[PDB]
């Protein structure tokens, strides 16, 4: 179906198979879902717009937090304009800028940053080099 390749081919694949502690997203600049994992949070739209703007200005949104689902992340260092990192509890977020679209991650303890990240990163270069 499209999900199992969307949950097996792209998202990320923590064992389980498929526990709901890790989940990923491909979502456009513009808010619209092109492929999420099973288990992804619904989001707002303005949540994607303030993540927008903080790739713009990194750092604008360290004094309110980033919010996701209406959790409230702790931006952390990421990469000016290209990866935005935010911690919550024994986990946190990563999301990378593509040209068309945002890889998101999510992830809590026992999946480790560096998991989630490699998905993360996968996924953004993947949609990079297909010009997206």
Known sequence: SWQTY???????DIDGQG????????VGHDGSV????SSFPQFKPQEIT??????????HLA???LH?????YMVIQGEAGAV?????????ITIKKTGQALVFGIYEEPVTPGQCNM?????????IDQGL
């Open 68 to 72: 996701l689902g209406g959790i409230k």
């Open 34 to 37: 092109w492929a999420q994992s």
């Open 50 to 59: 303030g993540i927008m703007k903080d790739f713009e200005e990194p750092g």
């Open 6 to 12: 969307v949950d097996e081919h792209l998202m990320c």
């Open 119 to 127: 998905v993360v990163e996968r996924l953004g270069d993947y949609l």
């Open 63 to 65: 004094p309110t937090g």
């Open 84 to 92: 935005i990192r935010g911690k919550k509890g024994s986990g946190g």
């Open 19 to 26: 526990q709901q502690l890790a989940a990923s997203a491909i």
